[PDB]
From a paper:
Following similar discoveries by other groups, LPI has gradually been accepted as the endogenous ligand of [name]. The structures exhibit the typical GPCR/G-protein complex conformation in which the G-protein engages with the receptor mainly through its Gα subunit.
In the meantime, synthetic CB1 antagonists, such as [name] and SR141716A, have been shown to activate [name] in cell-based reporter assays. The LPI-bound [name]/[name] complex shows a better density map than the [name]-bound [name]/[name] complex, which may be due to the higher affinity of LPI than the weak agonist [name]. The receptor side is well resolved except the N-terminus (1–9 aa) and C-terminus (297–319 aa), due to high flexibility of these regions. In contrast, [name] occupies only the upper portion of the ligand-binding pocket, surrounded by hydrophobic residues such as W1775.34, M172ECL2, F169ECL2, Y1013.32, M2747.39, and L2707.35 within the core of the pocket. The binding of [name] to the receptor is primarily mediated by hydrophobic interactions. A superimposition of [name]-bound [name] with LPI-bound [name] shows that the binding pose of [name] aligns well with that of LPI. The aminopiperidine group of [name] makes close contact with ECL2, in a similar way as the inositol group of LPI does. Additionally, F169ECL2 forms a π–π interaction with the iodophenyl group of [name], stabilizing [name] in its active conformation. A close comparison between [name] in [name] and AM841 in CB1 reveals that W1775.34 plays a crucial role in [name] binding to [name], while Y2755.39 and H1782.65 anchor AM841 for binding to CB1.
Numbering used by the authors:
A (entry chain G): 34 to 62
B (entry chain B): 37 to 127, 133 to 340
C (entry chain R): 15 to 294
D (entry chain A): 8 to 56, 67 to 230
């Protein structure tokens, strides 16, 4: 529950789906 | 919490060559190489970035329902209605026509270069040693056919779904089942762990997704809308954990919020039922396969 | 008879024109909806259904240019030539589309295996394109109808340069007698082959509406295209000094005028016998 | 560089494109029944060639693939019926054993009502008619079925009764054809019959593509 929310908060930075990246760091673009 | 609302989730590639329905795919650990096979008896390893057929492996059994790609990228696994799990050495000939099951195979996922966990129609999940040639342990306790299997992201435990609206968390080391979970109405079509390893999500033909944990050992929450009626063919996850995915029979892949309990996106672009769905090990981009024979790589 | 001429032609054309326009536009709509949705079973058939509907819509278009420009004097040889070429093209395009559809059905039924592989919608599109090409290529001799008049009452005073043997004989055999022969052989064999399937399954009570629709299609094609071309033959004989009677020739001319205004409504009869024996 | 490997990819397609002219010309035929039906004598009668078995043969340059479910048929959930692409379901039934005919009919009724097989034709076979032609007189067909109307000593009355019993099991009769036949255990030219019924199934498919109705 709360642990899942903390994991979401801490690891959101490496989520190319939650935060799509421009072609700078996007091999699929 | 802070909702993510909607995600503009766009395709980035489309992969062609399969002559029938795709039944399953697998994302490698390097995210670059993908493996998927069809029900025409063909495995193909794809270059996911460049859309290049790295390998096209024929099969003896054209009735094939699971595929695997080793975490070391060395081997692949292939199981189907002929009950024999073929381990293929990419470096492609059969490494081991490794047998021992009675029912048709439904899900096989390597633990290392040597151990493989298989689910079948025999209702028992069997952990096999390729070098020995025979099983090294067998988990029982289910009633229906174990169609779904998902490994923990520590190579220590695993989950199995078995057509009886229930899932078994079992321990690889202890060779026995550790916990059981209920909450559905129909078959467990696919199951996957939360990438941290203390929770998992289930999809069932009752058009309802669910999310449980091994910590509280209870049904944490559920996902369902009245306008959705098709069965969840496959699920996956994103590293953050604010999202989960669900392939559907209703021609589309619905991507839902894993916490806020609402739909956050829909991937169309499939001409048939969605059968395969995976997320790369670095979280870059989703891939889905459908009965079109068309794998496409969303992002 | 001339007042009767105009009254009959107008009272036939106006409902024919409106009905043909509406029905053929609706047919194009429906089969476009079927085709663009990437439907693979209903593609290689919607292609020639669209081609038929388009030829029929074009023949609908040339109707008011006979309902307001028939006897009205008009210093426009180019417009009258365009209208007459449109009329010939659309009518004989409907003719040849029907003939090709019937060959399609007999080839699918007599040979069920082959047409199941050699069934490219692109192949049907190639056949339709060849249909348009041949129709418009054959519609070149309609240019040589000028004669010696400038003020034209359209659909009249058609020149004897296009009444000789070399323009009539390759127009009856290759415009009616060959479509009649092909439509007859294909439709009869398709009926006799869907009938021979009583030696086996329930298709003897399942693929029965197909026989009714194929028979209806043969009947409509023949009854819209048998009398008018024999009237065409009668007028050719009038043009070859074979019939000299004045009252009889006037009656024959009225018969040909009425036969063509009855043959055009095939553009409304090809939209009922087809496009209503379908699901929608 | 990397793109040079795409040449190999093209080479791979130069093989897969070959399968394009086969997996489309290929006819799939399930082969079902029970133990007593006599599947083995059937297959051995035409000189044809773990879990499910497969056989490959050719009739008049057409490739047929008989997918013999070797006793795995008893499964009753969707995922195992990965056979919806199969052209036809060929049944065998031991006509003689009237006791087993109820179970055979129950198999028929629970196989044809698979919505998976809503677009599949059936080729039912009633095997061993000699052991029925020489047993209909001795054993009364009406002694087992309470709705038989014809003459229990007449062979053809019983034959038509059985056919109608099997054809009466289909809900939604209007979906696809149902052939049948009364062939003995010899099955001397049975491949011709299979070919004829497959050809008629393809004819029905054509009429479905021609949209004549
Ligand atoms: C009338 C008539 C004639 C004709 O022969 N007229 N002569 C009558 C007696 C001697 C002097 C004039 N030709 N067409 C005709 C027209 C279009 C094509 Cl595509 C082909 C043809 Cl043959 C029509 C005719 C007129 C109106 C209709 I509505 C249909 C046919």
């Amino acid at each position: 529950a709360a642990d899942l929310m903390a994991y979401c908060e801490a690891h959101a930075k490496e989520d190319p789906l939650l935060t799509p990246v421009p072609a700078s760091e996007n091999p699929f673009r | 919490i802070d909702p993510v609302g909607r995600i503009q989730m766009r395709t980035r590639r489309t992969l062609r060559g399969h002559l029938a329905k795709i039944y399953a795919m697998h994302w490698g650990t390097d995210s670059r190489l993908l493996v998927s096979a069809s029900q025409d008896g063909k495995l193909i390893i794809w270059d996911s970035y460049t859309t290049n057929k790295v390998h096209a492996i024929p099969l003896r059994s054209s009735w094939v329902m699971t595929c695997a790609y080793a975490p070391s990228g060395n081997y692949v696994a292939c199981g189907g209605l002929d009950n024999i799990c073929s381990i293929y050495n990419l470096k492609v000939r059969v490494s081991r026509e490794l047998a021992g099951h009675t029912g048709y195979l439904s899900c096989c996922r390597f633990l290392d270069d040597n151990q493989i966990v298989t689910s079948s129609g025999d209702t028992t999940c069997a952990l096999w040693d390729i070098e020995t040639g025979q099983q090294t342990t067998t988990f029982t306790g289910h009633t229906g056919d174990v169609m779904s299997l998902s490994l923990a992201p520590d190579t220590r435990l695993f989950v199995s779904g078995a057509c009886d609206a229930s899932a078994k968390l079992w321990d690889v080391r202890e060779g026995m089942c550790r916990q059981t979970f209920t909450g559905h109405e129909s078959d467990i079509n696919a199951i996957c762990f939360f990438p941290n390893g203390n929770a998992f999500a289930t999809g069932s033909d009752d058009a309802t997704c669910r999310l449980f944990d091994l910590r509280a050992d209870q049904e944490l929450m559920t996902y369902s809308h009245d306008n959705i009626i098709c069965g969840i063919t496959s699920v996956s996850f994103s590293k953050s954990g604010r999202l989960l995915l669900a392939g559907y029979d209703d021609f589309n892949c619905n991507v839902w919020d894993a916490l806020k309990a609402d739909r956050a996106g829909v991937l169309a672009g499939h001409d048939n039922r969605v059968s395969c769905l995976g997320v790369t090990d670095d979280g870059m981009a989703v891939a889905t396969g459908s009965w079109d024979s068309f794998l496409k790589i969303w992002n | 008879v001339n007042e009767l001429m105009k009254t009959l032609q107008f009272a036939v054309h106006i409902p024919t024109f409106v009905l043909g326009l509406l029905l053929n536009l609706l047919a194009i709509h429906g089969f476009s909806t079927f085709l663009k949705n990437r439907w693979p079973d209903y593609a290689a058939t919607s292609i020639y259904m669209i081609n038929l509907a388009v030829f029929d819509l074009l023949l609908v278009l040339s109707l008011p240019f006979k309902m307001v420009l028939s006897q009205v004097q008009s210093p426009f040889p180019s417009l009258c030539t365009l209208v007459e070429c449109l009329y010939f093209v659309s009518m004989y395009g409907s003719v040849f589309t029907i003939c090709f559809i019937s060959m399609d059905r007999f080839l699918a039924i007599r040979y069920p295996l082959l047409v199941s592989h050699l069934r490219s919608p692109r192949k049907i599109f190639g056949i339709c394109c060849t249909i348009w090409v041949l129709v418009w290529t054959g519609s070149i001799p309609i240019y040589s109808f000028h004669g010696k008049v400038e003020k034209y009452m359209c659909f009249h005073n058609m020149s004897d340069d296009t009444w000789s043997a070399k323009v009539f004989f390759p127009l009856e055999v290759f415009g009616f007698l060959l479509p009649m022969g092909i439509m007859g052989f294909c439709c009869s064999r398709s009926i006799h082959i869907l009938l021979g399937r009583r030696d086996h399954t329930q298709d003897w009570v399942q693929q029965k509406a197909c026989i009714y629709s194929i028979a209806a299609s043969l009947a409509v094609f023949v009854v819209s295209f048998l009398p008018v071309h024999l009237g065409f033959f009668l007028q050719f004989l009038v043009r070859n000094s074979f019939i000299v009677e004045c009252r009889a020739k006037q009656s024959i001319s009225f018969f040909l005028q009425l036969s063509m205004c009855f043959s055009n409504v095939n553009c409304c009869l090809d939209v009922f016998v087809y496009y209503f024996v379908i699901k929608e | 560089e990397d793109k040079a490997a795409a040449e190999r990819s093209k080479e791979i397609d130069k093989c897969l494109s070959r399968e394009k002219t086969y997996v489309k010309r290929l006819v799939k035929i399930l082969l079902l029944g029970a133990d007593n039906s006599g599947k083995s004598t059937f297959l051995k009668q035409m000189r044809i060639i773990k879990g499910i078995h497969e056989y490959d043969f050719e009739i008049k340059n057409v490739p047929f693939k008989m997918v013999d479910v070797g006793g795995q048929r008893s499964e009753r959930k969707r995922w195992f019926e990965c056979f919806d692409s199969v052209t036809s379901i060929l049944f065998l039934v031991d006509s003689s054993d009237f006791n087993r005919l109820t179970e055979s009919l129950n198999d028929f009724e629970t196989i044809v009502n698979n919505r998976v097989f809503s677009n599949v034709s059936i080729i039912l076979f009633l095997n061993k008619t000699d052991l029925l032609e020489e047993k209909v007189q001795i054993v009364s067909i009406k002694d087992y079925f309470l709705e038989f109307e014809g003459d229990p000593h007449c062979l053809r009355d019983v034959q038509k009764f059985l056919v109608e019993c099997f054809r009466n099991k289909r809900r939604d009769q209007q979906q696809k054809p149902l052939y049948h036949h009364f062939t003995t255990a010899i099955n001397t030219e049975n491949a011709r019959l299979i070919f004829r019924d497959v050809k008629d199934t393809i004819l029905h498919d054509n009429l479905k593509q021609l949209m004549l109705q």
